[PDB]
Write an enzyme that holds these catalytic residues in place. Structure first.
Site, short mmCIF file in Angstrom:
data_model
loop_
_atom_site.label_atom_id
_atom_site.label_comp_id
_atom_site.label_asym_id
_atom_site.label_seq_id
_atom_site.Cartn_x
_atom_site.Cartn_y
_atom_site.Cartn_z
N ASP B 7 0.64 -0.80 0.65
CA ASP B 7 0.02 -0.08 0.14
C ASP B 7 0.77 1.08 0.21
O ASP B 7 2.15 1.22 0.43
CB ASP B 7 -1.06 -0.28 1.23
CG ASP B 7 -1.82 0.92 1.60
OD1 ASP B 7 -2.35 1.74 0.72
OD2 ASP B 7 -2.17 1.37 3.03
N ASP B 9 -0.56 4.77 0.19
CA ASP B 9 -0.85 5.51 1.93
C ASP B 9 -1.01 4.46 2.98
O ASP B 9 -2.18 3.58 3.50
CB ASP B 9 -2.44 6.65 1.89
CG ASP B 9 -2.48 7.28 0.10
OD1 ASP B 9 -1.31 8.32 0.93
OD2 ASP B 9 -3.27 7.35 -0.62
N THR B 96 -2.47 1.37 -4.81
CA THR B 96 -2.82 2.23 -3.93
C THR B 96 -3.90 2.45 -4.80
O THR B 96 -4.29 2.93 -5.91
CB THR B 96 -1.76 3.76 -4.23
OG1 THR B 96 -2.21 4.48 -3.70
CG2 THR B 96 -1.70 3.59 -5.52
N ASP B 142 -2.63 -0.86 5.32
CA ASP B 142 -2.70 0.00 7.42
C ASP B 142 -4.67 0.23 7.48
O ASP B 142 -5.00 0.17 7.89
CB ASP B 142 -2.41 1.20 7.31
CG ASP B 142 -3.17 1.78 6.64
OD1 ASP B 142 -2.50 2.58 4.97
OD2 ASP B 142 -3.80 3.35 6.96
O1 LIG Z 1 -6.12 6.23 4.74
C1 LIG Z 1 -7.40 6.95 4.05
N1 LIG Z 1 -7.58 7.83 5.87
C2 LIG Z 1 -8.54 9.21 4.68
O2 LIG Z 1 -8.76 9.60 5.95
N2 LIG Z 1 -9.22 9.01 3.04
C3 LIG Z 1 -9.68 9.51 3.59
C4 LIG Z 1 -9.63 10.52 2.21
C5 LIG Z 1 -11.50 10.22 1.16
O3 LIG Z 1 -10.39 8.88 0.34
C6 LIG Z 1 -12.02 8.16 0.14
C7 LIG Z 1 -10.96 6.89 -0.09
C8 LIG Z 1 -11.45 5.90 0.18
C9 LIG Z 1 -11.15 4.33 -0.74
C10 LIG Z 1 -10.09 4.46 -1.37
C11 LIG Z 1 -9.80 6.22 -1.14
C12 LIG Z 1 -9.71 7.29 -1.04
P1 LIG Z 1 -12.95 8.17 -1.20
O4 LIG Z 1 -13.91 7.73 -1.54
O5 LIG Z 1 -13.44 9.86 -0.64
O6 LIG Z 1 -12.12 8.68 -2.29
O7 LIG Z 1 -12.98 7.87 1.21
C13 LIG Z 1 -12.81 9.19 2.46
C14 LIG Z 1 -12.03 10.20 2.40
O8 LIG Z 1 -11.10 9.12 3.38
C15 LIG Z 1 -8.65 8.38 2.40
C16 LIG Z 1 -7.09 7.37 2.85
C17 LIG Z 1 -6.70 6.56 1.15
C18 LIG Z 1 -6.16 6.03 1.43
C19 LIG Z 1 -5.88 5.47 0.51
P2 LIG Z 1 -5.16 3.34 0.40
O9 LIG Z 1 -6.07 2.69 0.81
O10 LIG Z 1 -4.68 2.44 -1.12
O11 LIG Z 1 -4.38 3.43 0.94
MG LIG Z 2 -3.68 2.65 3.03
#
Ligand SMILES: O=c1[nH]c(=O)n([C@H]2C[C@H]3O[C@](c4ccccc4)(P(=O)(O)O)OC[C@H]3O2)cc1/C=C/CP(=O)(O)O
Ligand SMILES: [Mg+2]
Ligand SMILES: O=c1[nH]c(=O)n([C@H]2C[C@H]3O[C@](c4ccccc4)(P(=O)(O)O)OC[C@H]3O2)cc1/C=C/CP(=O)(O)O
Ligand SMILES: [Mg+2]
Lengths: 192, 192
Positions: B7, B9, B96, B142
Site C-alpha cells: 500500500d 498511503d 494504491t 493499514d
Molecule cells: O488512508 C486514508 N485515510 C483517510 O482518511 N482517507 C480519506 C480521504 C477520502 O478517501 C476516500 C477513499 C476511500 C477508499 C479508497 C481511497 C480513498 P474517497 O472515497 O473520498 O475517495 O474515502 C473517504 C475519505 O477518507 C483516505 C485514505 C485512503 C487511502 C488509500 P489506500 O487504502 O490505498 O492506502
Molecule cells: Mg493505506
C-alpha cells in the site's frame, strides 16, 4: 460472476486516430502512415522505419498535454461497455497501461473516463503496466500479446481488432472481436 | 517468486501526518485530532464527530493541490521496499487506491513514487479502488479490512500498524507488522 477487463487505448479510446490527427496537424508537410497501412502495435517504430527523425516527432504528439484527454471514442465502445456493465452477473473494469512519461497521461485518462462514461466508471479504472497480475475471466485488448509477470494469466485474451493487428493470423485457440458490433455477448456467455 | 503488494498511503507515504500538518496550517484556531488519538480509518469522520464543520475543512486539506506530492515518507519505509525489491525471487508492486476526487491525487502519486523511489518503481504502480482483484502473495496495508469484488483474495493481508488501527486485536491466525523495523523479512520468507 464473469469479470471482463476492458482495455482503454485501442478499445475504448482511439489512440491511433488521435495520433495520426495530431501528427498531421503539427507536421503537415511530413509523410505519415495511413491507418489502413499501420502494421505492428508500436506506431512510433513504423514512423521510425519511414524516416528516423519521425520517431521523435510522433512521440511529441502522444506526450503532449491534451493528447489523451481529446481522444475520440471508438465507435460503439461506450454503448457496449455501458450495456455490458448492466448485464446480470457481469463485472467490468477498465484495465489500462499508462505511458512511462506519465505526466499528461494518468490524470487525463481519469478525466476521459469521467466525461465519456461518468463517475461510476472512474471507480472501475485499474492503471497498471502489467495486466497479467489483474484477475478476471476475459481481457479485451488490441495488443498482439499481453505479457507480464504471470506466465499464465487468469483471463482469456480476446484480441480487439485494429488496423495495426488486422493482418495477424491467429491460431484457432485464440479469439478475436472484430469491432464492438461483433458478438461480444456470445464471448461473455462462453465463460459463464 | 513472492509477489508483495505494498500500500502507498499509511505504509509508504504518511497521509495522517500530512493531513494534520495541513489542517493546523490552514485552520489554526480549530480543534484537531492529535495523531495518537486517531481511531478508525476514515479521518474525516472523526473530525466530523469532533465538530460538524470540521469535516469539510479537513477534506479541503486532502483535496488540495500538492497534498499527495508533499507527503513525508513513513519511517523506514523506502529503505524497506527498496531492500525488498532487491531480494532474490521477490517482486514488489505499489498497490494504491486514489481518491474519488482524483484530480490532484493520481498524477501526484506517480510523481511522489518517481521522486522518492525512482522510475523503476513508477513502473510497479497499480492504481485501483479494488485491491481484491490484484494477484499477490501478500498485501501490506493499514486499512483494517480490504474489501472488493473478489470474496477470497489471493493475498494474505498483513495489517500495517497505524494509530487509527492499533486498538484492534487480531486473532492468532492474522498478522500485523508493527512498523518497518518489525520483522518483515520473516513474513516474506514465510511465503517462499
Ligand atoms: O488512508 C486514508 N485515510 C483517510 O482518511 N482517507 C480519506 C480521504 C477520502 O478517501 C476516500 C477513499 C476511500 C477508499 C479508497 C481511497 C480513498 P474517497 O472515497 O473520498 O475517495 O474515502 C473517504 C475519505 O477518507 C483516505 C485514505 C485512503 C487511502 C488509500 P489506500 O487504502 O490505498 O492506502
Ligand atoms: Mg493505506
Ligand atoms: O496503443 C499504443 N500504441 C502505441 O504506439 N504506443 C506507443 C506510446 C509509447 O508507450 C509505451 C508503452 C508501453 C507499455 C504500456 C503503455 C505504453 P512507453 O513504454 O513509452 O510508455 O511504449 C512505446 C510507445 O508506444 C502505446 C500504446 C499504449 C496503449 C496502452 P494499452 O496497452 O493499455 O492499451
Ligand atoms: Mg490497447
Amino acid at each position: 460472476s464473469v469479470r471482463v477487463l476492458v482495455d482503454m487505448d485501442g478499445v475504448l479510446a482511439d489512440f491511433e486516430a488521435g495520433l495520426l490527427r495530431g501528427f498531421r496537424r503539427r507536421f503537415p508537410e511530413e509523410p505519415h502512415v495511413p491507418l489502413e497501412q499501420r502494421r505492428g502495435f508500436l506506431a512510433r517504430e513504423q514512423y521510425r522505419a519511414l524516416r528516423p527523425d519521425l520517431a521523435d516527432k510522433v512521440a511529441s504528439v502522444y506526450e503532449a498535454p491534451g493528447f489523451f484527454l481529446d481522444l475520440e471514442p471508438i465507435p460503439g465502445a461506450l454503448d457496449a461497455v455501458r450495456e455490458m456493465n448492466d448485464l446480470p452477473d457481469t463485472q467490468v473494469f477498465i484495465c489500462t497501461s499508462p505511458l512511462l512519461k506519465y505526466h499528461h497521461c494518468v490524470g487525463e485518462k481519469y478525466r476521459w473516463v469521467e466525461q465519456h462514461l461518468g463517475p461510476q466508471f472512474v471507480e472501475r479504472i485499474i492503471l497498471t503496466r502489467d495486466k497479467t497480475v489483474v484477475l478476471g475471466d476475459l481481457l479485451i485488448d488490441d495488443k498482439d500479446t499481453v505479457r507480464g509477470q504471470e506466465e499464465t494469466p487468469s483471463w482469456e485474451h480476446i484480441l480487439f481488432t485494429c488496423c495495426h493487428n488486422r493482418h495477424l493470423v491467429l491460431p484457432p485457440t485464440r479469439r478475436r472481436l472484430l469491432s464492438w458490433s461483433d458478438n461480444w455477448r456470445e464471448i461473455l456467455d462462453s465463460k459463464r
